[model samples]
Target chain A: AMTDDDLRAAGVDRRVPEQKLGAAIDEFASLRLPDRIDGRFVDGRRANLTVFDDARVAVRGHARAQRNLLERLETELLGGGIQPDPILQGLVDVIGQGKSDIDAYATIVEGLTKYFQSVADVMSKLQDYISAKDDKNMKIDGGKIKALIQQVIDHLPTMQLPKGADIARWRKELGDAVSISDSGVVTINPDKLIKMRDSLPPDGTVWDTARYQAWNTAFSGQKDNIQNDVQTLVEKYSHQNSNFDNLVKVLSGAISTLTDTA
Target chain B: AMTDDDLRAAGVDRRVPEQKLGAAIDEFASLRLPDRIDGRFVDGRRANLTVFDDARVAVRGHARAQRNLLERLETELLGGGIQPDPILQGLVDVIGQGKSDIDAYATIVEGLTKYFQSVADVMSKLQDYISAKDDKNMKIDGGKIKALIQQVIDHLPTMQLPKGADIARWRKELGDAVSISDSGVVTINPDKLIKMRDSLPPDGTVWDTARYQAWNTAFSGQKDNIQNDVQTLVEKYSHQNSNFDNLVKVLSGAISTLTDTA
Candidate 1:
């Protein structure tokens, strides 16, 4: 029978520092999302805003899941008598730390989906509003017309418009497009409103061009980084899982041989 | 602003069946390793056997990890408000089912590793015993030699040797290799033992060839299956994570536009 010393002398190192394992757990527990948006708009933009808020909540859940997974990993390693060398330990540490970034990622993705949908919504509504009138110079309530235009302007800031957007100038141009009297009355110009509506996304106007540009600005660099990070994690887990599996198979075969006389 | 009905009408389906989700958890919780070896030999083969027993214990730990991961995934999906369509739900179910098999896999892998090591150990010790002998016809106690030969026979069943091995014939041949008197006295045959030791693995002898054949019988079919299963899982998780990430990015962009006046 081989003693513990004999096994050790045979080159099996199963001893792992408890402190190091605990440190990994602590790192996972410390994971947090990026700062929440402060004084967020809640009332008028509830439809669009809810999507973003829900995504943030979802991200927090993902973080919790990440922490739980790490805890489980620690428990298994300690209880299973499966020895993790420094490389495996380092891999676990990296998994623990990697989850923190995911919270921010989910939020950003949700925001973009809503942005595209809202642009489509505003454009369709503006076209419908313009088409309802027969007379080219028809006078209408400025209140309703201004509200539709405001949705377009509201989307601008979140879109990450390029520096060339001259947002201040753009805002002025939009504001000048419609004028309301003291009684909230306005003379509608079909041509002008249609031109502005066409400037939204899915069209080739300057703003539409900028929307595409904004997309690149928002996602191009981060997309590759995120994909790479996810792939790295997948590969790591796959490798570890494979190693564990191989270990189990040979051990199982040995057990069968040792116990079965038939 | 889109109302709940409007969003629903727009074809966004976020509702998930709580029962279905709960079922997945239940399935995961039920995962178990193969039946533990009964009446296991513990003392006589402590050195060779600890490796197998440790693997069994480690397999249980892996099952725990799998269960915990499922729980974390459930929590994340629920709390994160991730909408699991039927396809995603099915994927989760598969993952839950998939983990049950891994416990068995790990045990088998560890068994093989120990099996190979033990064979080498026995061969080396037998060689050393032969080299230490000065007389080619030296008389030595049969106890030590018998014990070493028993190790070889003990490993036979676990190796899953082919039908052509004629194990019964092989066993009788090994037993006939030595003769012992009532007092445990025996005449050593160095040439006979050397031939036996050389027949073990890494030597291209019959047993060595049989060992390779046994490896294929044990692992060939399952390895590709395991690899495919794991890869499928990795791809699924990667796809889902990417979807979540994209959703967050667009939503974040929209939130930025809505909130940022500068």
Candidate 2:
């Protein structure tokens, strides 16, 4: 038989291992909604500001599902206590932290949504002003737009997010995410450098010395670095939290479903 | 008690389960060389054409480990017969197939090496030509170089390897990698999609219509659509392939180790 020690070593809850944690993560993985959002927004561009318009439309459904996930967690934690202590304070803070994480994501997604729209407007105007064709033959040229987008993306390594907030690291158990400087300067991995750069600009235009350097200084990833604040809370209080078992059960189902689908 | 049937259902070998597979894979995993590669090539740039040179350097040490893994399997199948048949011929072909896969990786690594060096030389010249600074102060403009680099990376989606040979699906048999499509297209999970794309051209670029459409027409991956060719061979001629158990054992360990690291 697998002992609690063994299960814990296998990444389950330490004191109280259950299928629920794995299951809950799997459930989160199973959310079919996010997959549906992939490349689904490609055609969302408005007629004139075509490229950025296209981009604005391209990311349509991803955030809504994330919002749903956030709300669902709130419901899951209804009866759960927010108990805190010296040792367990980290765990207790998880819920609020998670909420903040979700809120952060909300803010990011909203900003990106609005940003894309604004970008489309700028591109549309740029297209109208740049193109020399008759109005009937006028078509949007993404070259300048691409260059502008590329420049901004490239410039990231030269700037900082300046928010002084931590991004999610729990996924890698805090290994691969960020290393904070004494002054809240964030250094990220090439994987994230690639990810942040990717999200910033059109493909083929985002990589350069500037972008590479930008990755060194810029704070990327809007969410908290700690993944699964729920797990942290669960591990700390599964033996004591009244709703611990329910939390485990709910989360287990969620993760399990998510992963199975994953 | 975990019955043999249950074990088989749980993905242990049904006909004859053994620890050799797990141990061998652990042994392979225990090969400590790959770990030394972490950030190993961080400084691989020629002083002139630095960034791409750095990228080439970044990918060093990984393929060597894979070659060692491939060779280890050859030793594992020392006495195994390569018997051909209707159902099991696919399995018999695996040893050779795996060798080919390893060799294929070698070929790719070699080509990419040459390609990177050439790219570095080109970038070096570009840097010299473009910079207004002193010739001694000349530095590669990774923006243009990055654009070129990105173009090559981006072009991969439009074209298939075209050699049209099959690679091993042993990892999927051991439940680590996925099988290929009918035309050898590899369907990556979204997590992997995010990772791969993260490593590719920046993100928004990969999600656009051309990229998305390119993914559909562009054959990704190698080998067959199904996993467990070894098992099929085993089931067909347990008596013929003298090293059948050992074959399973070696591959099992190889995949398990590779996945744990992955």
Candidate 3:
């Protein structure tokens, strides 16, 4: 039913939007394994780190924030920080608590942002890596790393939760997750932010049924020849060239399972 | 620049949707390890049963049934007899609790025919697995399996939610993931789901600009050469095989490069 003419008619204008693009990028970034980010790694300690806790229970960022407004008000908690990043001491300033006027939370979040760019760099490379890595060694983390990453991601506007119909319910859930210090503080971990953002599929299944097919299709080969052609090309362009070649060779010979030809 | 006619003219649709048809035949049939259904292994387990937890948390079939007001509820929720299978006891049924003339719940849910067909088989699969002689050997508690499964499917979905949405906002920062039970809820695992959905044209290039290329005429390169024809035949025949053979190999290759292919 769909034709090339329809594609042109649909045009790039109808193409999934930029915001959605960002979300996709954010998502694909996660699908790949997160490498260990040593001290030499520049990205705020996010080594593809994942938070198991949030992996099980995290929401989108915007809804999370708007929901917080009520709690902030009800608790009369005006603890302030920037619209985007929060500084714990600055949080005290806004919420009317804590002694220091310092902006620890705000700085910490921003610092993580700068580091996240490093993550994005690694992500670009790792995306290709995950696409080509052996299954036995995917090496993704458990909880701590995931949570730290989520903390930084939640700060980004593209990934942040918006005010909405479900704000009240969302806030109650969030408030229940974090602990406010005796000093009137909230030390939400960065991994939680990334986990929540990662866990929340922007626009859910409506988004998935459309794209999953494409990715799967792209990966799904048409014949032993076509598959070899595509994956060989993918492998050539990918980093694990020698290993990929050796693998295909061994399998092809040992099993007579030439993916494309057979 | 692409047109419906161009796509039709180029012969893509016939192939793409056809590919989907093949995949759909057993779309939800299995999500298991290689030896998933093999005969007894060292642990004395026959098969690593794959089932979703529709238990009270995910969408407790009984609870979901109650929502449909049209049918008279009858299929009572037996809290105690919930498991006939051990490895699958992780699931629960929210049937009509101790007789309050509870046919009302079943009546309404039963009234909705199609939805029940979609879920009944899954519910039965979990229910029937409880009697597994070695269920305990799998470290599987039928009652708790779904929750554990949910843990691994970190980004799995309950349905579509989205980036910048409210569900994201009010969600837990990372705690008590099982507060919500699902036998095997419709998972929208964000990470995998998005990869399945989104299509990106690499990154950083600002736009999909089409340049005229100085109006140059391009020539198709093909000659009556022996090697070229041989390669073409190889490519074509390789591409013509059944997808089961074709799709799995390349997919395996792609997966193989998960750790190092930058």
Candidate 4:
């Protein structure tokens, strides 16, 4: 309701502050993170991997909004005077989180792919040792292990992590299964060779009980982590009505006091 | 891939828990609060009052997701065995916050509407005092203040509160301004009467300078509150990848430990 004459009298601009603030608010309110998924996988465990991918898309959208608002607050409302602001602090956190989200997704896929390759490496070595055992002295064909490794690498892009899930002790266990003899011959440790026999899926096995259970444990854990983290995100960003009212109280109170004193 | 035979051997079911969880998750993800508006009003300040109405539509959507998830978790995963759950705890909070969102909006509108009526009431009483002074007497027209009060009340549904925003103190200020004599004369306190002149919008007043400034201070404060609160929400919920990874770590570790012990 402020006219030009009123602006001149108060030594203020004719424009109302509410209009600008309202636009900014509307922009902020439009952001939303997607929180649900509904699809099936041949192996139920594989669903967890997709869930990770699904959640990332939603998180990234919200992070972009934070950046947008931070810019608006800086340019529109406070060009120079926007000092030591909590909103600014929060905006930075949001932006950082968004960048990290991209990194995390890469890490998960890379890590999962490597893990599958490792499992394939161990299993093929065991197959080599089994054949070697028939010869009275144990032996492994490095060529066969290399071939198996290649096959596993080829499938990395399409490999699915089921519920069973990884990895400090991982290096040592897989290390024992692989060896370079002085003559370039591959040999599996005789004792460790026997240890894996019970867990490894034989050629005929579709799903080895021991290995399937282990994977189920692993993937399910990752699934829960995604679920929990997103839950936190939802909880944290859901509403700011009270905090908004507080802003009203503080800003209005300050101005009223200033005007009264003046 | 765990077949029926593998699950049977492992003392589990081959059907998998996915279809049930997928349905639940889809239900959870679909709940999104709407955040859009395409309307305008005569006085932009009036638009701020309706903004309260607008924010409500989105807040309720988020709160609903929390509720849906909590129910799913309860029924599908933890049915009968439901113990203390952080997800459950958070859902209750979300639901409670959602309900309060409705109340807070009502409170803001109800409180704001009352505030407008009070301002009009005081102005009408002041008008009576101005008339009494012209008659060379200290008397107010009770009829006139009452008539003015009615007019203000009538416009309340349409009243806008963009800048000027308050409360308990208000009751006393307007209360002290209204009074009736045995002779049917309505009179305002002469002392308080003159004090208000400096704030009133007068001839050639485009926007009452003092009133506008006071309101500027008021609405500015509210605007900041909203901005800050929303910033917080973004900060809190914007990233979930890290947390999700942790969930995978913890749950997978627990199950693996149990399996090892068994």
Local error of candidate 2 at B118, Å? 82
Model 2: per-residue lDDT, tens digit, A150-175? 54434332112235344332222223
**Local error of candidate 3 at A95, Å?**
13
- Model 1, span B74-112: residue lDDT tens: 443332111112222322343343343233233333333
lDDT of 3: 0.25
Show the lowest summed lDDT stretch of 10 residues, model 3 chain A: A79-88
TM-score of chain B of 4: 0.26
Cand 3, B chain, TM: 0.18
Q: Residues A136-159, candidate 3: write the lDDT tens digits.
A: 222222233334445444553222
User: Candidate 1 or 3, higher lDDT?
Assistant: 1
Estimate the TM-score of every prediction. Answer: 0.21, 0.20, 0.14, 0.23
User: What TM-score results for chain B in every one of the models?
Assistant: 0.31, 0.28, 0.18, 0.26
Which candidate achieves the best TM-score against the true structure?
4
Which regions of candidate 1 fall more than 4 Å away from where they truly are?
A: A1-82, A85-262, B1-262
Q: Is candidate 3 or candidate 4 better by lDDT?
A: 4
Ranking by TM-score: 4, 1, 2, 3
Task: Write candidate 3's Cα lDDT for B1-262 as tens digits.
Answer: 0233433342323244233322321232222111112333221122111221211122223323223311221111111011121101111111111111123212211221112222223222332322223422222123332433234344322432222222222122111221222221222212321221122222222221111111000100111121132223223222322222222232233223322222
For each candidate, the alpha-carbon lDDT, in order, equals 0.32, 0.31, 0.25, 0.30
